[PDB]
Amino acid sequence: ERPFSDILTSIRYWVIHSITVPSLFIAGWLFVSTGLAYDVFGSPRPNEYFTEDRQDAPLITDRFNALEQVKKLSAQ
Amino acid sequence: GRDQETTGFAWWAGNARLINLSGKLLGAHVAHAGLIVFWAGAMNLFEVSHFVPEKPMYEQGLILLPHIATLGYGVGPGGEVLDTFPYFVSGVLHLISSAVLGFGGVYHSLIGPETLEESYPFFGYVWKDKNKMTNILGYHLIILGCGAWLLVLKALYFGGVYDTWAPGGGDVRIISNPTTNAAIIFGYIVKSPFGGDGWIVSVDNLEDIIGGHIWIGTLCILGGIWHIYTTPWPWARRAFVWSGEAYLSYSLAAVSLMGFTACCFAWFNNTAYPSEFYGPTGPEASQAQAFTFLVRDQRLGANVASAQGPTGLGKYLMRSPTGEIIFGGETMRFWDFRGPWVEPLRGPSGLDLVKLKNDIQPWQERRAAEYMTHAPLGSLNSVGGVATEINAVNFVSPRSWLATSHFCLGFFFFVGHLWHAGRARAAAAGFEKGIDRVDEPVLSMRPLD
Amino acid sequence: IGRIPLWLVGTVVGLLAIGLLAIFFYGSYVGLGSSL
Amino acid sequence: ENTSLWARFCEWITSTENRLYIGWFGVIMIPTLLTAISVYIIAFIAAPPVDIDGIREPVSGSLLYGNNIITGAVVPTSNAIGLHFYPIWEAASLDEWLYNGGPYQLVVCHFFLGVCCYMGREWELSYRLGMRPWIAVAYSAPVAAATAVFIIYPIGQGSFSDGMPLGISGTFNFMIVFQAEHNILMHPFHMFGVAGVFGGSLFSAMHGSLVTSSLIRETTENESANAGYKFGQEEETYNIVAAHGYFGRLIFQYASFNNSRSLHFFLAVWPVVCIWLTALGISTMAFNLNGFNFNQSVVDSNGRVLNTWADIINRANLGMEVMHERNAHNFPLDLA
Amino acid sequence: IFTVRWLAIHAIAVPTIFFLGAITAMQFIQR
Amino acid sequence: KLPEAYAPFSPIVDVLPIIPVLFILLAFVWQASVSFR
Amino acid sequence: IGTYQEKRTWFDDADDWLRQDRFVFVGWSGLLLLPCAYFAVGGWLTGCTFVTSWYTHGLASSYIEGCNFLTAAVSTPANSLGHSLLFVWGPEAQGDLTRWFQLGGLWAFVALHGAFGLIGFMLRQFEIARSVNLRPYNAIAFSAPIAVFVSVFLIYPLGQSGWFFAPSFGVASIFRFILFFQGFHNWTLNPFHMMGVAGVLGAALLCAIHGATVENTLFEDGDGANTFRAFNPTQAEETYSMVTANRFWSQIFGVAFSNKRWLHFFMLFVPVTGLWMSALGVVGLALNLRAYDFVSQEIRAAEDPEFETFYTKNILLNEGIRAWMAAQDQPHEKLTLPEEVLPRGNAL
Amino acid sequence: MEALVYTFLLIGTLGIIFFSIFFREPPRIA
Amino acid sequence: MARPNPNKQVVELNRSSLYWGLLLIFVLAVLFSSYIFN
């Protein structure tokens, strides 16, 4: 049955998860420290909000050309 | 200790298990006293660790150093800090005394005697023993009177206390001839709590402070001797509930009123809470705004008695609902304010026009400017100003922190008084567990409710 | 099967939770999103 | 033998056999609440305009002065008065008293007394009935909130004009001005209060639907389901075990309420403690503690300020600020 | 093993710890 | 700031206020130790 | 089934595999509930952590930016997109997940998947109540949160100019939406909203007062001061005194409950009716059918400067909200209102 | 003309409140 | 079934439900009258 009292108090569980829990923590750390979050999720880096072209908030102002317009307006 | 099967109280009510266990009860109390003395020492040393000589004590989030400085330690004329060694000594004495009290609390909690009755009849008590309950009350009343007289002694012969009402910005002054007049002492008590009277929060001079302390110390010692040498009267016996939880409920209602009173003292009083150490009060900051905008526009060559507002009332000066001249604007609601920086400019007709035009002082003008720039306005982030302001200044007034925290504590302690008054009455009655299911009172009452 | 006490495990995970929340409250005063 | 006048009156006051229990708390409640009810109704119908802000701009507030149910309000006391305790005998005329917001102060003082004695009377009836006593503790939450909007906020702000107007649109006005000055939405205690009333509706619908889900068959499709329950019956009318198994296999089998006692304790404690926290939210903002200030929190590497949702709140807050008390201000910073 | 309980607890724990490492990482990102 | 002799002891003073919060949490740890007995 | 042979099939095997006691009941509805709900919750937790709002609104709404819990959000897409479904394969994104995130497609993802997760949860309530053979009043109660969700996050943005005017999923964004409804819609004055307020506050009153009344009218079953150990799972007597509770509230309040079934049906009825009325009012606001004005009081206040009421103060405050929030909240209108024309009182 | 209607509706609700308090169906113990 | 209708039903409204109906209708009046008059 394992009613959650002998499975979180088991050294068999704890040895195998002494590597997966902090391996996950380190992987999440590197996902933010290596800028992969910036790359895959579209968030601009703290030094790349305003380019030389525009100095204000970007506006989409189109629908079917929205993809290439946000391409040209973003920081590449 | 014990379990639930031998006590009937679960862990979330485990302290209730030691209602009848006098030794463990005493140990829990003195261990708690160690906690109070420990926080006082720890926070005091932390505050003197985070203290900057330049900035006043209200800009730095200090709540204990202003208390010590109000007592008159390390401060001089105007409120500048001369030394922090008294504060350090206070903090260290508190830490070490907390170590001693914590040793005692741990001792009676872990290996102390279970009950103090069978061996130390002076200390052991039952809750229905009204004689010994009044005896312990008398011991503590004598202790309270001794503390009040310690403050009286400090004000009379041990350096004096800080007066903000003394000329020149205030200073540490020795109290001479306190007001021992019973009419002046008890007219504060009998006074209404509302505007213009403020109950006891409107005590506005150190002579009244120390005279009231003389009266409270002497009455407390007298009541201690009276309680040690008497037993409660039958009318009191009929009027009261005589269980330990009932005594706790009485204490909770009392300290709840005390917490609300301390909230109002921190928010309104400026003689027991000098504005140099605690910052300006709300009324003080509003009157300071109107005052400095008066003097700026005077120095810019304008008339102040004229120039009514958009409402036809008077931008700088109007008349209060009783007649005397007060500062114009919404700060009219704070026309009841009295501070050391307005009294030299305030006469019989309220604000004197010629005195307000001519008799300005530089220290008063700077004090008004700072009491504008450090108003008790802030957020939970400790961002100063109204909730729409920028994140540039890091300031929330110690008056704001004290008033808010102690209103919260006073409210929960009133609710705790309700909980304990009800449970003590129900436990004396036999209702603490539920209705008996065969001797239900409603079934013995007629219908139609 | 129960070779580590459940309360000891719970206290340690509570310590990591409190340390994590203390880190989260600390990081609001420094770096990004810190009003400075 | 019980022939004396005081003891006969005592047995009349303390009697459970009354249609409405009076008790010693009710002998303070009933005159105060009747006085407050009378003055509130009369003021709501025929109160002349009230100079709330102290700037000689009287606000009508009453039905006979051109207000409807939504717009009529007993207008707060004058800002010129502040907290100065204005009763009828202080005023020269009833005309002056009605001009300076006297009915509001009368209703507020009598209503605070009335709710305090209502909570006491709830305790005292529970005492004379052999009940357990903490229903008064549960009622201490709306009492705390009423005192926070009728007493504590005026005391912390210096003026009874700051109190909540006794009305509907006045309540809305109180909220708009309150958020303008204090940003209550960004306060954790108010967030707890909203969670408390949202969870109150959550758990009211939850418990009602679980009890109604597990009703026991006694009636037919002809008769309403309530007709299966008989007043004073000993058997329980629903299957607690069936509802508990339902909820457990619905969300989490262990994390349900196996004690109906503990379940009803949770139902009582959740909105009561959250309304306690949000009442202290108002009480702490009375002394200018306010909500969170997250304006210009995020800036870029070159120091430019990014707008944020908190900054949109700040923009709406400024709109709520400048327009409120448009003529009452003479100076930039609104310290008063 | 590989039970329904296993998958349902892993879907809510594995990204949770990964994300907690993520926020803790950005919690020390300067500007 | 602290006196010059107690300047190296300022970091250990900077933690001292949190001990009462640790005390109530320690009461809960003790109850977990006795398994909520 | 029903005294017939009915040889078994893959449907019956799958049904028997789904309808069984597990750690979590999956069921047929769990084919919808579990993935849609996981994706809605995980998408919200993803957007609040990484996905930016710099391009859809010109704001910051993620932890990677520096926002905390109270301030981060999954932002509604730009008004230019209108009511586009923002499919990742659709025209606006063109298959590309990265620039799909920053164009606002994550709001449409979270909204559609949250709606289907809500449908899956109500189907789960129906299914579990059927399997345990209990009446579906839990699903009838859950009908009101779905009514609120569809009227607020679906019907209202469909009625307005686009998804941009929907609530963005996040605490400060919800507060923006609320102050928006105050300034633009006068949602406080709406009778349907105040019916919702009465329903929710009355439901909280019922919850608190049923809890306190039950917890204070118990029967003894004692020999222990902890009352929580006086309850056994399977018995046939009332645990608290119904007659004592009725007597207490009859003498305190004047009226009291005397039917347990009607008491709990009232506890069910109050929040459902309140939330349904709020849903109907938001549907009215979807078409800008506001209860903004009282025509008689407005014409009286226009023909009399001396007429001043709290309602007129609210109207002025709403003008202040609109004019001070439009420029920064609506970038699509390109509203560059100068500091000159903004409404403003004396001083401040 | 409107204050008449509002006053009538308010006292009607109060009258129904009074009748519901003091003129309810008396509950029976059986 | 027979010449008379077999589904013959009686309707019931206790005084409590009368009170809820009257409060409900009068509260709808108090609430909505300000808006109908507008």
Ligand code: CLA
């Ligand atoms: C101000 C806080 C406070 C204090 C002073 C006490 C005090 C006490 N509690 Mg208690 N309790 C508290 C909070 C507190 N409690 C809280 C918040 C809860 C809810 C979780 C409980 C729940 C609870 C239960 C269920 C019980 C008690 C009991 C007791 C008594 C005996 C405990 C014991 O000896 O067991 C043994 C404890 C230990 C062996 C661990 C203690 C080790 C030390 C003392 C911890 C502190 C170390 C300290 C830093 C050392 C200082 C030394 C000095 C020289 C500086 C005791 C007097 C028991 C009782 O009622 O007696 C019958 C009981 O069963 N409490």
Ligand code: CLA
């Ligand atoms: C009760 C009186 C009191 C008062 C008036 C103050 C006031 C102050 N303190 Mg202090 N402090 C206190 C007690 C008090 N403290 C105690 C008991 C401790 C020991 C832990 C400390 C330790 C302490 C430190 C270490 C520091 C301060 C600091 C400060 C200053 C800044 C406050 C701030 O921004 O923090 C933030 C404000 C809050 C965190 C709000 C508190 C939240 C409440 C109390 C809990 C939430 C309620 C909860 C939701 C309800 C649920 C109930 C239950 C289920 C938990 C300020 C003047 C700072 C300072 O200036 O140093 C000089 C500083 O760093 N205090």
Ligand code: CLA
């Ligand atoms: C989280 C718990 C907590 C914390 C951290 C605080 C913290 C604080 N409280 Mg407090 N309080 C609390 C809970 C708490 N409180 C609760 C639950 C209540 C009941 C509702 C109260 C009610 C309360 C009141 C009534 C007051 C405070 C006050 C204070 C402040 C000063 C404390 C003080 O000096 O008292 C005093 C210390 C003692 C009485 C112990 C004896 C000290 C002796 C008598 C002093 C000797 C001085 C002597 C003159 C020195 C000269 C020596 C010689 C030459 C003669 C302080 C910051 C005060 C305040 O500032 O108001 C805002 C105050 O008046 N609190």
Ligand code: CLA
């Ligand atoms: C913390 C201190 C403390 C405590 C807990 C007690 C507790 C008690 N005292 Mg007491 N007493 C004290 C201090 C204290 N005393 C002091 C300092 C003195 C000297 C003045 C006295 C002198 C005294 C006497 C002469 C008697 C008691 C008595 C009693 C017992 C019954 C009191 C009663 O019936 O309720 C409260 C009493 C009343 C409600 C009626 C008193 C009338 C008013 C309220 C008194 C104050 C007037 C003033 C206008 C009130 C407004 C102040 C307010 C706004 C703050 C009780 C156990 C009686 C007793 O049993 O003797 C053994 C009694 O005869 N005490």
Ligand code: CLA
């Ligand atoms: C000095 C005052 C005082 C004292 C001595 C007692 C003493 C006692 N109380 Mg009690 N109580 C008090 C005040 C006090 N109470 C207050 C102010 C309230 C609030 C209304 C309560 C509400 C209360 C309840 C509901 C109960 C008791 C109970 C008890 C008994 C067992 C307590 C226990 O071990 O629980 C265990 C302690 C814990 C589980 C720890 C509680 C953790 C809290 C929730 C965290 C709060 C911390 C947080 C920072 C607060 C911030 C709020 C604010 C400052 C912003 C005991 C004799 C029980 C009883 O009746 O037994 C007979 C019980 O049921 N009390």
Ligand SMILES: CC1=C(/C=C/C(C)=C/C=C/C(C)=C/C=C/C=C(C)/C=C/C=C(C)/C=C/C2=C(C)CCCC2(C)C)C(C)(C)CCC1
């Ligand atoms: C370090 C230092 C220092 C020093 C100090 C000292 C040297 C001190 C101390 C200390 C101490 C020394 C403390 C203490 C404590 C104590 C206590 C805390 C006490 C007590 C008592 C009691 C508690 C009692 C009780 C009782 C009895 C038993 C009998 C009868 C009854 C009664 C109750 C009375 C200084 C600051 C200079 C400098 C810096 C550093």
Ligand SMILES: CC1=C(/C=C/C(C)=C/C=C/C(C)=C/C=C/C=C(C)/C=C/C=C(C)/C=C/C2=C(C)CCCC2(C)C)C(C)(C)CCC1
């Ligand atoms: C029994 C019990 C308990 C407990 C209680 C208590 C409350 C206790 C305590 C205690 C205490 C109350 C303690 C305290 C202490 C103290 C100490 C231990 C100290 C010290 C000292 C020092 C060493 C210092 C030093 C210094 C100086 C001198 C200054 C400068 C700096 C420095 C810091 C270096 C509990 C709850 C858990 C559970 C139940 C039972």
Ligand SMILES: CC1=C(/C=C/C(C)=C/C=C/C(C)=C/C=C/C=C(C)/C=C/C=C(C)/C=C/C2=C(C)CCCC2(C)C)C(C)(C)CCC1
């Ligand atoms: C220091 C000071 C002062 C002085 C003060 C004093 C001198 C105080 C006192 C006082 C007193 C001398 C008080 C008294 C009190 C008392 C109370 C507050 C009480 C109570 C109680 C009650 C409420 C009761 C109840 C009841 C009844 C009614 C009958 C039956 C029984 C019973 C219990 C239920 C002054 C302000 C000048 C200035 C500042 C500082």
Ligand SMILES: CC1=C(/C=C/C(C)=C/C=C/C(C)=C/C=C/C=C(C)/C=C/C=C(C)/C=C/C2=C(C)CCCC2(C)C)C(C)(C)CCC1
């Ligand atoms: C995007 C997307 C997607 C989805 C995804 C998902 C669905 C995932 C996830 C996820 C998740 C699922 C995440 C998470 C996170 C979490 C977190 C981050 C947490 C938390 C918590 C906290 C931080 C807190 C804690 C605490 C403490 C420590 C103290 C006290 C208590 C509490 C609880 C408050 C895909 C790819 C399919 C595609 C489409 C789009």
Ligand SMILES: CC1=C(/C=C/C(C)=C\C=C\C(C)=C\C=C\C=C(C)\C=C\C=C(C)\C=C\C2=C(C)CCCC2(C)C)C(C)(C)CCC1
């Ligand atoms: C609630 C709970 C829990 C838990 C959690 C935790 C994690 C807790 C904790 C806690 C803690 C974390 C504790 C600690 C503590 C400690 C203490 C309480 C101490 C002390 C002492 C003292 C008094 C000190 C002193 C001193 C000084 C003064 C200076 C220097 C030197 C020395 C250090 C010695 C669990 C989950 C299991 C289950 C559920 C419930």
Ligand SMILES: CCCCCCCCCCCCC/C=C/[C@H](O)[C@H](N)CO
């Ligand atoms: C607070 C007023 C009292 C002022 C003087 C206080 C000093 C001590 C006074 C206590 C007088 C003792 C009274 C004695 C009472 C007897 O024990 C009883 N009548 C029984 O003999």
Ligand code: OEX
């Ligand atoms: O009344 Mn309504 O709003 Ca509270 O801040 Mn001051 O006072 Mn008035 O101004 Mn801003």
Ligand SMILES: [Cl-]
């Ligand atoms: Cl306004």
Ligand SMILES: [Cl-]
């Ligand atoms: Cl102003």
Ligand SMILES: [Fe+2]
């Ligand atoms: Fe129930």
Ligand code: NA
């Ligand atoms: Na203004």
